[PDB]
Amino acid sequence: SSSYITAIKNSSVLEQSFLRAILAEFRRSGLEEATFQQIYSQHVALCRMEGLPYPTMSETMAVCSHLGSCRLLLVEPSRNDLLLRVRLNVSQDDVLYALKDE
Amino acid sequence: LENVVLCRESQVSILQSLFGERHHFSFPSIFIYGHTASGKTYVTQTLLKTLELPHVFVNCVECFTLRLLLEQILNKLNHLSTEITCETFNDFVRLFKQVTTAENLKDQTVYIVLDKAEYLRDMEANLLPGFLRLQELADRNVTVLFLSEIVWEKFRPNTGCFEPFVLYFPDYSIGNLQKILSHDHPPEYSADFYAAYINILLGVFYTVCRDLKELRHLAVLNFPKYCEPVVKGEDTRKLWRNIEPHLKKAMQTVSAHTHVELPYYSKFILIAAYLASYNPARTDKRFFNHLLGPKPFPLDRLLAILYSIVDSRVAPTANIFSQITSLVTLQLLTLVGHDDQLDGPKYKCTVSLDFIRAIARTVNFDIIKYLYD
Amino acid sequence: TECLSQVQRILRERFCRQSPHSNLFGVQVQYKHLSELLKRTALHGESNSVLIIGPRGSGKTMLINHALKELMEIEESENVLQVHLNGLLQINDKIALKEITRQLNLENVVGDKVFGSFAENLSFLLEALKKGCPVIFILDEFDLFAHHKNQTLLYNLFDISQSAQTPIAVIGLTCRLDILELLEKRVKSRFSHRQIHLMNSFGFPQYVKIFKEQLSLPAEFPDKVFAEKWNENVQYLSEDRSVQEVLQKHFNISKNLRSLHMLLMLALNRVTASHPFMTAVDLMEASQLCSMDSKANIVHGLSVLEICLIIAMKHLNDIYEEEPFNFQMVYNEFQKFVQRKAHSVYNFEKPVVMKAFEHLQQLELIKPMEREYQLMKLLLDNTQIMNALQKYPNCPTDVRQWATSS
Amino acid sequence: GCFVFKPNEDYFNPEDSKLRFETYQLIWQQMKSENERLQEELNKNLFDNLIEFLQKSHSGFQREIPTAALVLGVNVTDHDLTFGSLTEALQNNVTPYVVSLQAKDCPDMKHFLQKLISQLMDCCVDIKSQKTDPKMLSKKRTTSSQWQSPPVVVILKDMESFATKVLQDFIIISSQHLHEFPLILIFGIATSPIIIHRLLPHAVSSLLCIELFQSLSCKEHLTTVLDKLLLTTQFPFKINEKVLQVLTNIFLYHDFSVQNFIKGLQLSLLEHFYSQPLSVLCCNLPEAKRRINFLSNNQCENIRRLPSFRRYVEKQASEKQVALLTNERYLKEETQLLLENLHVYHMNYFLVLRCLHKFTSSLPKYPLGRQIRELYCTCLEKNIWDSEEYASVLQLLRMLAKDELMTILEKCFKVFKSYCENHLGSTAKRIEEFLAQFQSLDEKFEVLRENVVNFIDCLVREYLLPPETQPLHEVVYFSAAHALREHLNAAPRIALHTALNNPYYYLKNEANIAPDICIAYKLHLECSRLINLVDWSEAFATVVTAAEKMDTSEEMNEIIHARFIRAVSELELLGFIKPTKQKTDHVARLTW
Amino acid sequence: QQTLRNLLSKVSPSFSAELKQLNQQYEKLFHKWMLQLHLGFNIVLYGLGSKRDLLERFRTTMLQDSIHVVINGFFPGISVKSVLNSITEEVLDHMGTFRSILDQLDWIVNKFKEDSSLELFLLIHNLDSQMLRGEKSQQIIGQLSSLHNIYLIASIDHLNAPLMWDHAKQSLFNWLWYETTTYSPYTEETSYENSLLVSLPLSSLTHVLRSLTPNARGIFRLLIKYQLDNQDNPSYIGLSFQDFYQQCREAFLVNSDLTLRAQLTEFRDHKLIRTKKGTDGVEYLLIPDNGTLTDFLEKEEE
Ligand SMILES: Nc1ncnc2c1ncn2[C@@H]1O[C@H](COP(=O)(O)OP(=O)(O)OP(=O)(O)O)[C@@H](O)[C@H]1O
Ligand SMILES: Nc1ncnc2c1ncn2[C@@H]1O[C@H](COP(=O)(O)OP(=O)(O)OP(=O)(O)O)[C@@H](O)[C@H]1O
């Protein structure tokens, strides 16, 4: 079986909204690259919509290194810190099925 | 060594509590960030000197290679013999178990204090996550105490690591900066009067630098200058109104002359290099914003504008080309094609305009309408 | 008393050393999958080489050491010769060979000839062991292990695990997900595939139970009355909804079961001076000392010349947008603001303004990508500065009007 | 392909080689030795201040680290000599712990520390009679417990070519523990102390103690070495004004260095000793009198037949011309007193030239010459009283007659009152002749009339053009300007332009016959915007089709194409056209 | 190339007598060179035609007694490592140290100060080339030649040939400059460089492979893997220096920024990595085909 959808299925809430921010920016741009402040703005919008508290980017970068450690996405270093160009390691319909199934 | 705290008591207390007594385990790794003013080795050294938790202190500025960093850790540790050699990391984890088996330090939580870890950040990729897991790597009751200038968020290895417990040592507050910037040790005055001086000086001066070291330096400079007309003339308000006239200029003043004699063709070379750097949107044809900086331009354009500036007896000798190479070693010109080839790349100008004005005016040339207008 | 030092000693080890506490939760099926495989590779000469993948901070090392201890309890010491490696220490092949020499007590025979083919080297290690026999290879931090120059200690282990048939388990402990795709194709096609574990977390209402079973004083008795009093206090704090509120807040940032250890560790550091039974508010401030905004602590501490400079950089985004700027445009914007203002307090002259830059570069809020008037890059958010300027305690009115102008 | 062969002195080449070469070696070795002594004298006022400053900043040690940033000149050529002298001075009057770093032997920190401790180990192990950092401190603790713990100083030679990282790390390491190991670094800033703020960020720049020093601005260094080296009576070999003009121009315009000037004077001396067979008696006067009296007779015919002496033949009477033409015994006698007159002309020339220099440097705006160098120039290019510049001095000197002129007549008279008996015998006894004029200086008309007779006697008597006034002057003077200038400062970018545009060497080629490559370049730059390959090959084929028919077409196309491609590889090779990649083909006109 | 060079020198260079005479002007100039070189000068001579045969005739007529290291500069095998290596073995009659270039530089300096009248002087054809120059490279020749006991003679061919000497670099060898012209075509350069009418084969990459550190070999393993794995993507415009820095740093091949930049610029010398500037201004890196790039590290790992 494939590891990645089960990793998304047992991810936390802010990770799932981070992947939703990733797909929202990838629907906006169309590209496979995105910088961290763009998906951070998308993540701020989604945490606003869900009634969650404010996503500080210490937490958002901790969760970005969480998802980059587990290779659901492909990362730039934490030294660049706002200028991280992220690619998505899995295809988009896979993560749409992963957050669509429930 | 004298005052342990000077009113930063809660962070001191939670760190002191976090150490615990000796026979039980503590944290693996503790990271402390904060500003460079903020006492981050004052507080921990006066904390560690009190209880005498048997510790090793290092600076990673000192150890520029990995072997010296392991060597001084193991050599300072075993005193608490010969140089107990370790070329590699696994040698350090091997010899650490033999070193930490003595009755001074068998049960005691050994602290390996690491200062200015941002230089350790580019030592290797191995050593930082290897150092963060030392409590279960060697399993010998260790707590590696980090302190750094930089945030932890850039400091992580982008694989993840054992995330340390992270403290923020706070910056000093204003009334705390009245108190702890030497309300102790005034030699000859009342402490009220030296506090009155520095209370006047600080509230003026709390907008440029909150660094305690240089403010201690500036205070011990401009306090005897303040202190002389009290003990000579004789009322704090009048000499407050005298000391701030000196304080504005002492602020402004903390670079002899910009003019440098040059050989004559070198003067004309960098005159031509400035003039082809600062308005060069193909305005070669006319005579013969500014704020973004110097635009790059190739060598033959520089030689053509050199021929236009100088009296026409110039020959392209070996010495004028050797001189144009030797201008770059003195960093008055820069090649921005770093390796494009030996043939003449874009040479961009890197000297200020007033210096250029002085070099142009010392050989009969007014150029400011000629330069960008 | 006896109680406070004893509860801190017995709770601190399973707290922050991650000592072997016997309760394990969410992992029973993966453990029971591992155990019979380990029993039949250990009891018999056959060699199968399982692989485990999970996230950092959860699972792996606790599971393999717990299964290790429970297997070591069964005798016939069975002459299983375990060997612990890590990916971090043994970076190269020459270190790895001598480390296997170290663990397997080989230096009675001297072996002092560096052989060319390292299959002969590994087979000699196993050969001189075999005439002297099971081994269990615990290959921790496999993702760093997969960056050898020639992948020797990856591939020769798999070749010997299929070919020498000395009892072997190559148990790889990884952290990144693609251990197969990062693995080179001769080894990944060779013998990487024994059955692969996956490791993940579980639901929040059982995670409150794992908080309670983590925090409770154990079946070891320091003093049984204090055990009953304190774990009843653990349950009374556990049923209170503010602890549940901060624990749900901790769940959505962290499913990790390592962050819970630290979050609870700060709370237990607070408790033994007075009120040995603690509050939900004490857990709340223990969560609060685990910070959320690392950058407001940096920006909040800075003096106001750096403040008006960094809001000038923010203003450099809000005209002539998206270039990596240099010093001169920052100087121009600062001068245009200070000429908009009437007072001559803050018209600080040119070499002072460079000092704020070369202090500010050390904080890495500004990035280098010529030497002093070039191409500097900002890595920051507006809104943390907008919150920081109202939290500045001695914030002057003119930089406040600069903030409202923006 | 660097193949080595293993093999498995007094050759110079009339002008016979042995005493010629020994005369060369004597003159140049003497000149170089006195050059080094006169180098080390001038910097004493500079670095004996530095000994005071370093002694004061060491002795108050019971947070700071002292730096003394020298501002040396732009001449990197002679920076070794000042540092050798300063190393000598600081080694003698302060500590025998002086090391220097070069900024080319340490790109990073391990090299820095290893070469520093190796230099320190040899410097301590000589005068008492290892990658580690704190062992250097342990070396300081062992090796000098006593003698008031003398401070180890390092000498960074180039501040500028150091990278900032290794320098910052070293200053923070040294400033961390200077409790033991007091270190006082002295980096030689090549430009100006502005750039120590540029190369050092503010935390490390705030760590220390800056006290800058000047250095000798090089114009009043070369006035000393030109003034002592050739303007004296002492050294037997003078120089022509035109060759000197070439040497001083390539000083003052391009190079701004003095070691290059001494290389130019050495080359002039060498080429003079190659050139002419009468150069052998370039000596002092009894050493001249040694073998004037015995010499080969064809060189004595050469002493008859060189053109300055034949000018002297033209001005003289027949009854001694008939015996002095050919016979050696009288030719020795007249040439000996001619060489004595040469020394006489030098000795009465130079001291009154210095007198005129002091009398002219006193003037407002100094219209004749700025310094002592150019006064040699203005009295030899034009005739001096013919020229308008000494006319401007003479027009100036009338109404300048006040007590400034009398006071500086007294002052210039005092400085050549030191040179009164430093001349010690004058060739007209002009010291006490002019001093007999100059002794009424203590007792406003008299300054005017005394001025008139002094400059008239002075300048009309001796201050004349040395070639025409003096026969046998070729022996002392060397003159070949644009022979030398191309040896010392050549121009290949003019040489290729010349030999490519006009490759006429001596049959008909000046404005099609005997290039291949100049045909290629000339035809390249007859279509002078840019070029593509095939049409350029056809144009070259057209012009050597003309060359062929001014003395089958497919074999001719083959050989024309082959010699075309042999030409075009060189025209790429020699700094012209750069290959235009990824297109079909073209060439790019890279030099206009 | 070969069938192109069969037609070379078929019939008739259009002058021979003045070429023989113009070269025959310069044979009188040689004892001046020997004396001038004995005093410690250094002769550069430039020209428009081939003058290495004049230097060969010079070394035949006057260098039958002394050591000469005839360093060709035209074929791409020679770098200054080979200069120091051959001058260590084949001149000093024993091998030297091996750790670094500066160590053998200082050591070969150190051998000559004690051994008087050893009297070795090399001479270099084509001192300016694509391979010979460099601030690491030329300064070793300079520091070598600055001594009393070593007398180099060179030839420069380029139009920008005195661009690679600062005054401090120029003060190491006392230059004086001769003018020559021969008009002979430079047959060795034009032979052994290239011809355009017909990339790099395996031999020079094996020679760089055998003269570099194994960590540099592991570095170009990474770079050639990232090149070969994205060969048919026309948007792949090369890795950045920062991306290659971190992907080199993850496999522990190099420690610092400056070490990797120095390795990059000494591999940029060999023309097996080219820098391209994109619209950011940041230099990306791509080397000059794909099928010749799999043969090496196919065979470097069997
Ligand atoms: N609370 C305090 N009371 C008295 N002096 C203090 C206090 N805090 C800091 N200092 C001064 O600061 C110096 C120590 O500097 P500090 O501890 O700030 O270094 P640091 O924070 O480690 O520096 P960096 O962060 O740059 O490594 C001491 O010498 C002392 O003079
Ligand atoms: N199911 C579980 N049962 C008991 N403890 C657990 C469980 N999951 C996680 N933990 C705790 O989480 C931490 C896991 O540490 P461990 O080293 O075993 O895994 P890991 O940290 O992911 O591995 P690595 O050290 O390679 O990152 C330990 O504190 C362990 O006590």
Residue numbers in the entry:
A (entry chain A): 760 to 861
B (entry chain E): 4 to 83, 91 to 244, 249 to 268, 295 to 328, 349 to 433
C (entry chain D): 14 to 89, 91 to 146, 152 to 388, 396 to 432
D (entry chain C): 9 to 16, 27 to 31, 37 to 85, 98 to 164, 193 to 506, 548 to 615, 625 to 664, 669 to 709
E (entry chain B): 269 to 466, 471 to 560, 562 to 575
Per the authors:
In order to acquire sufficient ORC samples with ORC1 incorporated, an additional high-salt incubation was applied to cell lysates to release ORC from chromatin. After this treatment, the amount of purified ORC subunits, especially ORC1, was substantially improved. While ORC1-WHD is located in a similar position as seen in previous ORC structures, ORC1-AAA+ is not as stable as that in the crystal structure of DmORC. In State I, in addition to its interactions with the AAA+ domains of ORC4 and ORC5 as seen in DmORC and ScORC structures, ORC1-WHD also engages with α3 of the HTH motif from ORC2-WHD through its β-hairpin motif. The weakened interface likely permits ORC2-WHD to sample more conformations.
The origin recognition complex (ORC), composed of Orc1–6, is a highly conserved heterohexameric complex, which plays a critical role in recognizing origin DNA and promoting helicase loading. Each of the Orc1–5 subunits bears an AAA+ or AAA+-like domain and an α-helical winged-helix domain (WHD). Away from DNA, metazoan ORC resides in an autoinhibited conformation with a closed and constricted central channel to preclude DNA binding.
